[PDB]
Amino acid sequence: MKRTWQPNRRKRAKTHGFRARMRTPGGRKVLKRRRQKGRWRLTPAVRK
Amino acid sequence: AVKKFKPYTPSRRFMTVADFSEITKTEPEKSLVKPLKKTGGRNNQGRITVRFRGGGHKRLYRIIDFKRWDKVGIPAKVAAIEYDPNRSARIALLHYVDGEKRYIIAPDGLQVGQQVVAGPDAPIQVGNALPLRFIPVGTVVHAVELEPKKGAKLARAAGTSAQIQGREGDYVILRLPSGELRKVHGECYATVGAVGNADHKNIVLGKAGRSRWLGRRPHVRGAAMNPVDHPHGGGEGRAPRGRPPASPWGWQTKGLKTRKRRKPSSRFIIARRKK
RNA sequence: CCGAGGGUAGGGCCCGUGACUGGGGCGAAGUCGUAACAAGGUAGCUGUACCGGAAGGUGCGGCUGGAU
RNA sequence: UGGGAGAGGGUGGUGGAAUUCCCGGAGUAGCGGUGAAAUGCGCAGAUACCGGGAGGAACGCCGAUGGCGAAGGCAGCCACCUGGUCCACCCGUGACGCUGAGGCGCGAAAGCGUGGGGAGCAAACCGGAUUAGAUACCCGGGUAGUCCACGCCCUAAACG
RNA sequence: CGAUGUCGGCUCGUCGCAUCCUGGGGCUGAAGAAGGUCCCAAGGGUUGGGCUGUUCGCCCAUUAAAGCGGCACGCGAGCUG
RNA sequence: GAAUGCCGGCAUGAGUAACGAUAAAGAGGGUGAGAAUCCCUCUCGCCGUAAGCCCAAGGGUUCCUACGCAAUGGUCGUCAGCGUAGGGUUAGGCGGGACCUAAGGUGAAGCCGAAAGGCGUAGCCGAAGGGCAGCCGGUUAAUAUUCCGGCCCUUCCCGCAGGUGCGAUGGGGGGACGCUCUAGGCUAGGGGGACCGGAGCCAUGGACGAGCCCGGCCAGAAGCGCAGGGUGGGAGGUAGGCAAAUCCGCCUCCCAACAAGCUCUGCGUGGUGGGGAAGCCCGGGUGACAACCCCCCGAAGCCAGGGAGCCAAGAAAAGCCUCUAAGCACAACCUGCGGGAACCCGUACCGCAAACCGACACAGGUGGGCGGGUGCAAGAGCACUCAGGCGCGCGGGAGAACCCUCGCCAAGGAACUCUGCAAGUUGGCCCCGUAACUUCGGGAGAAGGGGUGCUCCCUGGGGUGAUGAGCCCCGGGGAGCCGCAGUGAACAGGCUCUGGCGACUGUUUACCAAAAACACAGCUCUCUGCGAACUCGUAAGAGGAGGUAUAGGGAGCGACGCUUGCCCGGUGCCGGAAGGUCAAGGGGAGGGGUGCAAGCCCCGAACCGAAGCCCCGGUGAACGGCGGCCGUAACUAUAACGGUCCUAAGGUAGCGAAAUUCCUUGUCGGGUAAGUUCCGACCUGCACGAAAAGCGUAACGACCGGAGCGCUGUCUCGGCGAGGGACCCGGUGAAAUUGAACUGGCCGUGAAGAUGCGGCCUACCCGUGGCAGGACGAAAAGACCCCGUGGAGCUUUACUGCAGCC
RNA sequence: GAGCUAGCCCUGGCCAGGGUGAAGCUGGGGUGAGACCCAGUGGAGGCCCGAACCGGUGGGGGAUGCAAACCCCUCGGAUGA
Numbered sequence A: 001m002k003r004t005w006q007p008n009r010r011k012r013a014k015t016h017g018f019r020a021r022m023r024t025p026g027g028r029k030v031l032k033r034r035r036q037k038g039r040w041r042l043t044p045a046v047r048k
Numbered sequence B: 001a002v003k004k005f006k007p008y009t010p011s012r013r014f015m016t017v018a019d020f021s022e023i024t025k026t027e028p029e030k031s032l033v034k035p036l037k038k039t040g041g042r043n044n045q046g047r048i049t050v051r052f053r054g055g056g057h058k059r060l061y062r063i064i065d066f067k068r069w070d071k072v073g074i075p076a077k078v079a080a081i082e083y084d085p086n087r088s089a090r091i092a093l094l095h096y097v098d099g100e101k102r103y104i105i106a107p108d109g110l111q112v113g114q115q116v117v118a119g120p121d122a123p124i125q126v127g128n129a130l131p132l133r134f135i136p137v138g139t140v141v142h143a144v145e146l147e148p149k150k151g152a153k154l155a156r157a158a159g160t161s162a163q164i165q166g167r168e169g170d171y172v173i174l175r176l177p178s179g180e181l182r183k184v185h186g187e188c189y190a191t192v193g194a195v196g197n198a199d200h201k202n203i204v205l206g207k208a209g210r211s212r213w214l215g216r217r218p219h220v221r222g223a224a225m226n227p228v229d230h231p232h233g234g235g236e237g238r239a240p241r242g243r244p245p246a247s248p249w250g251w252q253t254k255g256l257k258t259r260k261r262r263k264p265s266s267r268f269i270i271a272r273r274k275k
Numbered sequence C: 001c002c003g004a005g006g007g008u009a010g011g012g013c014c015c016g017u018g019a020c021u022g023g024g025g026c027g028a029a030g031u032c033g034u035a036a037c038a039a040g041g042u043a044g045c046u047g048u049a050c051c052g053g054a055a056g057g058u059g060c061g062g063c064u065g066g067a068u
Numbered sequence D: 001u002g003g004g005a006g007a008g009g010g011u012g013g014u015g016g017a018a019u020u021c022c023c024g025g026a027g028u029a030g031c032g033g034u035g036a037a038a039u040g041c042g043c044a045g046a047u048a049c050c051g052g053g054a055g056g057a058a059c060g061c062c063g064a065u066g067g068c069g070a071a072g073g074c075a076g077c078c079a080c081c082u083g084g085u086c087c088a089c090c091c092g093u094g095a096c097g098c099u100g101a102g103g104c105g106c107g108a109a110a111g112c113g114u115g116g117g118g119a120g121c122a123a124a125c126c127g128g129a130u131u132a133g134a135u136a137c138c139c140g141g142g143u144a145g146u147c148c149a150c151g152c153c154c155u156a157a158a159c160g
Numbered sequence E: 001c002g003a004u005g006u007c008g009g010c011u012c013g014u015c016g017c018a019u020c021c022u023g024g025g026g027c028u029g030a031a032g033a034a035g036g037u038c039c040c041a042a043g044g045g046u047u048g049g050g051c052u053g054u055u056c057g058c059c060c061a062u063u064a065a066a067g068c069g070g071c072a073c074g075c076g077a078g079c080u081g
Numbered sequence F: 001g002a003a004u005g006c007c008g009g010c011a012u013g014a015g016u017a018a019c020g021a022u023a024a025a026g027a028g029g030g031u032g033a034g035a036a037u038c039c040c041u042c043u044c045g046c047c048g049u050a051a052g053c054c055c056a057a058g059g060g061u062u063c064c065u066a067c068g069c070a071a072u073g074g075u076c077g078u079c080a081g082c083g084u085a086g087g088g089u090u091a092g093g094c095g096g097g098a099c100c101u102a103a104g105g106u107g108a109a110g111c112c113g114a115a116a117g118g119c120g121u122a123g124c125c126g127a128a129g130g131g132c133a134g135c136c137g138g139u140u141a142a143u144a145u146u147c148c149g150g151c152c153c154u155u156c157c158c159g160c161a162g163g164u165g166c167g168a169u170g171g172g173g174g175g176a177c178g179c180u181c182u183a184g185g186c187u188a189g190g191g192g193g194a195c196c197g198g199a200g201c202c203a204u205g206g207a208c209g210a211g212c213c214c215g216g217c218c219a220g221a222a223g224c225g226c227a228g229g230g231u232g233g234g235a236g237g238u239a240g241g242c243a244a245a246u247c248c249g250c251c252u253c254c255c256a257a258c259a260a261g262c263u264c265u266g267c268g269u270g271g272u273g274g275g276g277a278a279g280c281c282c283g284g285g286u287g288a289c290a291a292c293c294c295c296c297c298g299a300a301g302c303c304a305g306g307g308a309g310c311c312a313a314g315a316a317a318a319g320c321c322u323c324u325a326a327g328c329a330c331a332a333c334c335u336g337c338g339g340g341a342a343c344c345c346g347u348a349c350c351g352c353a354a355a356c357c358g359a360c361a362c363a364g365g366u367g368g369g370c371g372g373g374u375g376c377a378a379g380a381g382c383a384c385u386c387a388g389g390c391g392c393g394c395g396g397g398a399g400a401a402c403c404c405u406c407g408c409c410a411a412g413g414a415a416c417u418c419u420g421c422a423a424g425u426u427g428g429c430c431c432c433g434u435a436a437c438u439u440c441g442g443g444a445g446a447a448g449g450g451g452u453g454c455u456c457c458c459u460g461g462g463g464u465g466a467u468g469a470g471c472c473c474c475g476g477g478g479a480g481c482c483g484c485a486g487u488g489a490a491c492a493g494g495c496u497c498u499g500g501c502g503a504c505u506g507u508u509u510a511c512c513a514a515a516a517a518c519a520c521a522g523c524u525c526u527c528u529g530c531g532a533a534c535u536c537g538u539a540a541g542a543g544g545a546g547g548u549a550u551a552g553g554g555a556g557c558g559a560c561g562c563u564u565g566c567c568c569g570g571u572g573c574c575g576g577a578a579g580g581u582c583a584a585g586g587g588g589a590g591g592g593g594u595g596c597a598a599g600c601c602c603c604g605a606a607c608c609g610a611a612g613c614c615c616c617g618g619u620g621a622a623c624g625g626c627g628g629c630c631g632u633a634a635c636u637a638u639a640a641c642g643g644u645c646c647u648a649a650g651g652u653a654g655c656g657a658a659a660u661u662c663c664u665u666g667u668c669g670g671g672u673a674a675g676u677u678c679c680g681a682c683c684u685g686c687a688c689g690a691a692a693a694g695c696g697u698a699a700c701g702a703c704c705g706g707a708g709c710g711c712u713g714u715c716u717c718g719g720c721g722a723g724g725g726a727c728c729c730g731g732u733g734a735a736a737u738u739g740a741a742c743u744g745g746c747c748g749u750g751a752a753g754a755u756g757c758g759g760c761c762u763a764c765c766c767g768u769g770g771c772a773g774g775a776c777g778a779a780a781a782g783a784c785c786c787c788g789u790g791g792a793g794c795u796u797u798a799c800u801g802c803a804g805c806c
Numbered sequence G: 001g002a003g004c005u006a007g008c009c010c011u012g013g014c015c016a017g018g019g020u021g022a023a024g025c026u027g028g029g030g031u032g033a034g035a036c037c038c039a040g041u042g043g044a045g046g047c048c049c050g051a052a053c054c055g056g057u058g059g060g061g062g063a064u065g066c067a068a069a070c071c072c073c074u075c076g077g078a079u080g081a
């Protein structure tokens, strides 16, 4: 049947993207936390 | 004159439709329309704030002239009468001798080709607009402003009217369509006559899908719901109300008055509605 | 080929009968009340409506085939 | 052809009396109701009186033993649209008449559908009396309905 | 109770005997025929249908007879549900 | 040494199940160490509204070539979407951007919020919508509307000429719109040709033929032709289009009007440029100077912004055209022609799937376009087939039980069973014919029947064409032929009678309920006079609604018909300027602490003093509620009638053993041989009853009952047959479970059901196919039941608070 | 976190073929005029049959699955809420 993951590059970028994150207080704490942890990537990769 | 159908489907048994016989023009005036932005009953938060809305036919808004003191003294000709999907009334296309064009809501009796005019001096004729003080007592009147220069507010839907009862200083006394008696300032404008399309109330929607076309989504009874949802929700089997009948939010809904007690407009309301 | 008739399927009129049910007729001395004939004790009758154990009562309008 | 009387019919308008309710004022201990009462209403200011307002329904006197209509039925006053009918004159047609199974139309009240309207009245209903009872008669309330539009119903002591 | 699946049916049997029939007896208020009552006997047999989820029970048509009980009210790692 | 402990390793089950659609294979020849599995050829089968082809998304090198086979591939592997390396994606016109706006988002101004932040007209962003210029063919191992060829076109810059009051983000026009149905004319696409071109072929009995087999086009600027769209021209006035305006709108007058003209599209033609089969020979070469023509069918596509009808009344903005304002009129803009200029990103490949979403090369899921022919009434249905693509990444045998999926069956025909569950039957089209009842539509495909192929002959009408021929479409009559059978295969209703419920079409518990549930038109009550009520938000601000009582919120009921009774004492809500109670506050009789005192400081009665509550009324389609005992008729029985207690009032009409009736399978009647169900009645209704509506109701239902006919492997009662498994052999090889085991029966015993204890009996050691009685077999720390001063949802006249309202 | 699912908003797309035959309109009849009747035309509808597409009624299979909801047969809607 239709499963839950239906990839869509625009959707991915507009929801989880670096700019979406910078716009809200909580998104910035995400960026700050994944920085402090040392994540190689702070935000999902989409081809664009 | 509502029109019937032969019972050739279960729903055509009872369906009635308007006759559309006063209509003389069947596409609107390009310069006077704009898109009517549908809401679904959602507010600027996106939350439903009026349940069960959405899904109706697409519509354009037709700008209606609810002031008419905009153009004192300038007569206009009744060019056309048109269907308006944003209101129960029909609407009348007006060509002013100016060249300006404008819609009004179409009074009862109004014929294409006649002239109407607005102002303190206009004739007392179906279609004219005067401040209330200059309209003789007993006149049936529609599209009444409620405060001067603020726009016509009262008696706008199909078939309605207000009646001028008496005068008192700067105010006149109107009997509104609800039967309330109210003081409305004499400088408030009003249009002579009743609103047209009086047969509107006798239309039988006839099928569920027709409510859908109007943007009315199905209404769910509280008695059908659960207690998380509604005072009347719950119960094994059917259940009577079991408490004073109530709204989803818990206030009582059989009798409980709701006009704010200390409202300044009370001084101008002589007598609440009847019946 | 047509053909008595036999078979299949579906209708129409009639007759008989049927748990139960509707009033109707009749029947020497049953029970309830007293509507009508006298102004019958609320003049009567009446078409209709609604109501009531029952006759009946009341509304509306009609008639005199009503008294004084 | 000329004239007549008439609540004949339909539409629109509109005029005063009365009842009810609302507002103001003035006033106080009862009002109402009956065979007698009681229920009801009233000092939270009624009844009785004066002024203003709203709204519906019916048109006093004239009015008659009257008038008009085929019948049912028709009554303030006004305009309009319309039927019947009679008289005069003796002009026109030249029996073109009478009745009329079916058919079609009209048809008090009540009642029914859809809107409206709702003052007074009032089936149903509630109450108070009366009574052995009183699902009545009398009294206090009161909903359909009584009114308007359109559509049905088609009955009668629709009788002379 | 860190689970011993529960009513009825179906299928498959197997056992007890306080025996429904068939076999053998005694008594009879046993003439015969046919019954009643008790004793011995478990080898074999013990039908089909209508109603109900039913077990049971009632009924229809038969039969020599249409037995009553146990097996976790036998049988869901065999089925049904 | 135990914690269903934690991490890791390794066992058992076991050479066991399985190897992923039952579309299917066989042989020859190659290659190689090795071949059912790679390549090639021949034969066979499968898809063909796809299992073929093209877009979009998503994926991201998977593409092509060489070299590989450890692992990945459910087996093998020389092969591969695998490993290594090299190569491969070319645009002014295709798609996106340097254009436009939609929802939405963001946001000068501005508003609001302890902070963070929330709003917000303009404006800006935002597309699969608008707008905009490229078609055909060839080339590569791999890209192509991108390279190349041919023929076309767009914008920008600059110049020449010619024309004009030029000029904008401002005004205006246009852009610009629905649903159904649809005319004419074309095009795509298709069928036929006795005509045109072609390598050939004559077989096995016949055919050298008007034979068979193959093919008979594509793109094209101007001009021209056919078919369509869009559009009146002039004058005078002018106060409106937030400045101006010669434009637009509005009034007038004259002329033009089913037209025409102008303009813009589509189709045809068109200079010219391409393509071009079978077959044969080694993707290529030939065919080939290839031929390229006639007729028929014909779109849902095109002309298009076409036409009609309808109600539910159908985006915006830019491009573009026109008007003018500053300005400027040496400019500028319009037209024509010439030269020059024209950027960024994508482009490989997969794409109904082995490359995307599902952990897998997973029988599942994934939007748009094309989707050929024949016959079957039509069609995208079905069967077979074209082009093209496949045989589904384990095979070889055998021919047991048993399971799956399938075919048939004597006599019987529902006897099966909770139930005809399941499977039969029926089955398309044409014609005849068709009942109760009904809201007049319907019920209806009611039921039930007859016809159906082929051949000859005669004949009616239509489309194209020409009025004819030919081709094509609808028929009509007669006479025949064959078979068991003519919708000869495939696709394709079983029917009726009668109840319950719900009017109806719809909706639902994604993944155990599709229903009688929810919704529904319709009915009623109630709130709301607009800065409405109500809702979301601390607020600003939104929705309501750019609506206004014929409207908006809430609530119950649920098409329609006939109806909807009595109770207002309690609760609710509505009304009541009196009375009672009533907080802060007012008032301050009278006290008190302290101080020499002036004073300072505290307590404080009467009385005035909101809402609420009390109190007086109203109100049921507001919450609700609608009696008991005893007596009585000239047979008996039963009570129309009476008595008395109680109530706020004592259940009306209608219905009734009911989706409600306990006793109960009530009783009677019907249907049956037989009927706890069913239907019809009765009424002592345990415990119906009137908008949590009462009683009916045509039509409707994958709803739940009862009966009958038809027909059956459901059954008496089973038999045989097919294929996929099971079984054997080669290859690959799991799983839960598992204290260890050298693991029999009886009768006892035991913590009360023993392989393991006692006594007896029985029993050589080890497997394979099978069956399920036991190992209180596995699975899951019982979901029932209790217990814990465990949890959570929900309710209220439990307590206590809070929002909100007064 | 609404790339699943529920609702709404904006903008697009899709629904083979066949059947039934409403209103209106035309003509005829009818009447004083009418209503109304008859035939033709017409092409309505939460109309009918049936693909695509959307569903998920009954049974069977599957049940360490092809699959953490699938497969076969059957069945509902298919111009509309």
Ligand SMILES: CC(C)C[C@@H]1CCO[C@@H]2[C@H](CN[C@@H]2C(=O)N[C@H]2[C@H]3O[C@H](CCC/C=C\[C@H]2C)[C@H](O)[C@@H](O)[C@H]3O)C1
Binding pocket: E003, E005, E006, F782
């Ligand atoms: C009067 C009765 C209520 C008495 C009651 C009957 C219920 O069961 C029995 C109780 C007594 N214990 C039984 C039980 O728990 N049995 C369970 C079974 O659950 C699976 C089978 C399917 C589920 C059925 C039963 C559940 C409860 C599982 O496979 C079985 O091993 C078994 O665990 C008594």
Ligand SMILES: [Mg+2]
Binding pocket: A002
């Ligand atoms: Mg889903």
Ligand SMILES: [Mg+2]
Binding pocket: A008, A009, A010, A011
């Ligand atoms: Mg995307």
Ligand SMILES: [Mg+2]
Binding pocket: A008, A009, A010, A011
């Ligand atoms: Mg996207």
Ligand SMILES: [Mg+2]
Binding pocket: A008, A010, A011
């Ligand atoms: Mg997205």
Ligand SMILES: [Mg+2]
Binding pocket: A014, A015
């Ligand atoms: Mg976001």
Ligand SMILES: [Mg+2]
Binding pocket: A013, A014, A015, A016, A017, A018, A019, A020, A021
């Ligand atoms: Mg972002």
Ligand SMILES: [Mg+2]
Binding pocket: A025, F116
């Ligand atoms: Mg912050």
Ligand SMILES: [Mg+2]
Binding pocket: A025, A028
């Ligand atoms: Mg910060």
Ligand SMILES: [Mg+2]
Binding pocket: A040
């Ligand atoms: Mg790094």
Ligand SMILES: [Mg+2]
Binding pocket: A016, A021, A030, A042, A043, A044
């Ligand atoms: Mg992140």
Ligand SMILES: [Mg+2]
Binding pocket: B003, B004, B005, B006, B007, B012, B013, B014, B015, B016
């Ligand atoms: Mg109708």
Ligand SMILES: [Mg+2]
Binding pocket: B006, B007
């Ligand atoms: Mg009708």
Ligand SMILES: [Mg+2]
Binding pocket: B018, B019, B020, B021, B022, B023, B090, B197
């Ligand atoms: Mg109209």
Ligand SMILES: [Mg+2]
Binding pocket: B030, B031, B033
């Ligand atoms: Mg516009």
Ligand SMILES: [Mg+2]
Binding pocket: B037, B039
């Ligand atoms: Mg809005």
